[PDB]
Amino acid sequence: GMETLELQGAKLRYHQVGQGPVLIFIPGANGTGDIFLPLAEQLKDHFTVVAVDRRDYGESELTEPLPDSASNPDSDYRVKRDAQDIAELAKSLSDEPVYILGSSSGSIVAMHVLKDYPEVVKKIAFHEPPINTFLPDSTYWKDKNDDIVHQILTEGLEKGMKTFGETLNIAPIDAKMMSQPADTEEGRIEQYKRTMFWLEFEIRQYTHSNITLDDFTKYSDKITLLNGTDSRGSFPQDVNFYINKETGIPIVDIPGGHLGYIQKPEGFADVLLNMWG
Amino acid sequence: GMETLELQGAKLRYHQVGQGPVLIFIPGANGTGDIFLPLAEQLKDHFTVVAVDRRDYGESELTEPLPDSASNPDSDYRVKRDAQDIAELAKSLSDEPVYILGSSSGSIVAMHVLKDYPEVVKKIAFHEPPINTFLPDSTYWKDKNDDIVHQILTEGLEKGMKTFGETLNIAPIDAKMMSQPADTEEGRIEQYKRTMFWLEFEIRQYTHSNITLDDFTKYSDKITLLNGTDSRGSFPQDVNFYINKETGIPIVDIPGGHLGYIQKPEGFADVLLNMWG
Numbered sequence: 132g133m134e135t136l137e138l139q140g141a142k143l144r145y146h147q148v149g150q151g152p153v154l155i156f157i158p159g160a161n162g163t164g165d166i167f168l169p170l171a172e173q174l175k176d177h178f179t180v181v182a183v184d185r186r187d188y189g190e191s192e193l194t195e196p197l198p199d200s201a202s203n204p205d206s207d208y209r210v211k212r213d214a215q216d217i218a219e220l221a222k223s224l225s226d227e228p229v230y231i232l233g234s235s236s237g238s239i240v241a242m243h244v245l246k247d248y249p250e251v252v253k254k255i256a257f258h259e260p261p262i263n264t265f266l267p268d269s270t271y272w273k274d275k276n277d278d279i280v281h282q283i284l285t286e287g288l289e290k291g292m293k294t295f296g297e298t299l300n301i302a303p304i305d306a307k308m309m310s311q312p313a314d315t316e317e318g319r320i321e322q323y324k325r326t327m328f329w330l331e332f333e334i335r336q337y338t339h340s341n342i343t344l345d346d347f348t349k350y351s352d353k354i355t356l357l358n359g360t361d362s363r364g365s366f367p368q369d370v371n372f373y374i375n376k377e378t379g380i381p382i383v384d385i386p387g388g389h390l391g392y393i394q395k396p397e398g399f400a401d402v403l404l405n406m407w408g
Numbered sequence: 409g410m411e412t413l414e415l416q417g418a419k420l421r422y423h424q425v426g427q428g429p430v431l432i433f434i435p436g437a438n439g440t441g442d443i444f445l446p447l448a449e450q451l452k453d454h455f456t457v458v459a460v461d462r463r464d465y466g467e468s469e470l471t472e473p474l475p476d477s478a479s480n481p482d483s484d485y486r487v488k489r490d491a492q493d494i495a496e497l498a499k500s501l502s503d504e505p506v507y508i509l510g511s512s513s514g515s516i517v518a519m520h521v522l523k524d525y526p527e528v529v530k531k532i533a534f535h536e537p538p539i540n541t542f543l544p545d546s547t548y549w550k551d552k553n554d555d556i557v558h559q560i561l562t563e564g565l566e567k568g569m570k571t572f573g574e575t576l577n578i579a580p581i582d583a584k585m586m587s588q589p590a591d592t593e594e595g596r597i598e599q600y601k602r603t604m605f606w607l608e609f610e611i612r613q614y615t616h617s618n619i620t621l622d623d624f625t626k627y628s629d630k631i632t633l634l635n636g637t638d639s640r641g642s643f644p645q646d647v648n649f650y651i652n653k654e655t656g657i658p659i660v661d662i663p664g665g666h667l668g669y670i671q672k673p674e675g676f677a678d679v680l681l682n683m684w685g
């Protein structure tokens with residue numbers, strides 16, 4: 132049971148309890164306002180307490196995708212959008228400037244609220260801010276954070292890729308090609324992220340989707356099943372053999388493995404041309 | 409360099425080369441049509457080859473977010489939307505039914521194009537489809553794929569969380585709370601996903617965002633800096649000490665560590681009241 136404020140690109144959800152001046156709590160790394168709710172119990176006699184789920188977290192939901200650039204460590208999109216969210220929330224809840232407390236990265240949102248929308252701040256508390264930009268050694272801390280994040284994300288993706296590799300039962304010609312890594316750290320990372328997306332959002336949904344053999348017999352005349360010559364014994368060939376066994380739909384052998392259309396493009400083309408020429 | 413077809417929820421990007429009847433290549437696990445360009449070069453004198461970046465991949469781009477339900481293994485949203493993308497693309501390029509070849513999971517898209525939009529299909533090829541739904545004992549293969557994906561994603565997340573934990577120089581009280589398990593397996597994983605989002609899309613961007621000390625001095629009488637009593641020696645306290653050193657803005661000590669507001673909510677509230685009530 133949370134309140135909603137619809138904003139450009141997101142539905143912002145927040146908790147609210149109590150009476151008095153508005154006091155907005157901006158969460159840090161956990162992103163959600165439930166973490167303030169025991170504190171809110173202590174304050175509801177003297178403040179109208181508002182604990183926000185920031186738009187990328189919790190019960191808040193995006194209505195437009197994040198820009199592709201938000202993964203750049205130099206992007207200012209999210210922090211500025213979060214600060215605008217707090218300012219429009221303040222404005223919906225009172226006509227007088229409100230109290231604001233942010234913790235950790237949420238204290239950084241708070242600082243951007245004060246910088247860009249000072250008119251909404253009556254008083255503000257920055258609880259243990261980890262901002263480094265104005266520090267004498269800001270370049271060191273920025274580089275250190277960047278190395279830490281890269282290490283965490285890289286080790287997690289590498290473990291996922293290693294475990295994926297442990298399950299793979301694939302043909303040698305495909306394994307050669309599947310092992311070719313991109314030429315930059317960023318491109319390898321993108322390959323890993325793409326694999327993780329396919330695993331979570333595609334393989335189960337598509338391989339158990341609603342197709343029956345009756346869907347194929349209705350138009351059997353249009354269909355050709357293709358098995359690679361270099362991928363024999365693999366599970367997808369067994370699928371084609373079953374379709375063919377039960378429908379009579381023809382199997383055509385074609386050069387290469389599961390990736391035969393890039394392994395042996397000339398031979399693959401020759402078969403397609405025979406099939407459909 | 410690619411062509412663009414704007415559809416509901418996405419800009420669909422595709423390679424187009426050649427002459428003659430349209431032939432649409434639907435990519436499998438890599439999601440992108442560049443993998444077919446060598447084959448396209450072999451075929452372009454005989455077919456107008458169209459090689460698609462499916463809408464979640466490559467140069468295609470979503471204009472609305474995926475439904476939260478898409479991570480459910482029984483969701484049919486993406487496979488059906490992919491099939492509709494192909495049928496709309498076919499209708500935009502040819503008045504007559506077209507040739508289609510899909511590979512692997514892209515051949516499952518092709519099956520749904522034939523099922524739901526047979527009027528765009530002249531001939532179709534299924535290259536090594538991995539669909540199990542109509543196979544005898546389909547449930548074995550479904551359960552195996554679900555176990556595989558679960559093991560990959562969760563072992564990757566756990567390694568990332570492990571590596572994150574090794575980098576933390578944090579106070580006893582905060583670690584004790586970080587170390588407390590979430591009640592559910594779903595809640596564990598959600599905490600892990602939230603941490604990975606914060607790492608990639610929040611910490612570097614916010615901690616090196618454009619705040620200067622001048623921004624604080626301009627409204628110094630509005631601001632209170634807060635240091636936990638149980639997190640002494642932590643980096644965020646050094647930040648507050650520097651701001652105070654440079655601006656005169658006061659530091660207030662407050663019970664707890666970095667998570668003091670939920671560790672010791674009455675003490676935290678008591679200080680906020682002495683501050684603002």
Ligand SMILES: [Ca+2]
Binds near residue numbers: 187188189190191
């Ligand atoms: Ca959510």
Ligand SMILES: [Ca+2]
Binds near residue numbers: 285286289
């Ligand atoms: Ca490693």
Ligand SMILES: [Ca+2]
Binds near residue numbers: 464467470
């Ligand atoms: Ca894209």
Ligand SMILES: [Ca+2]
Binds near residue numbers: 541542
């Ligand atoms: Ca079945």
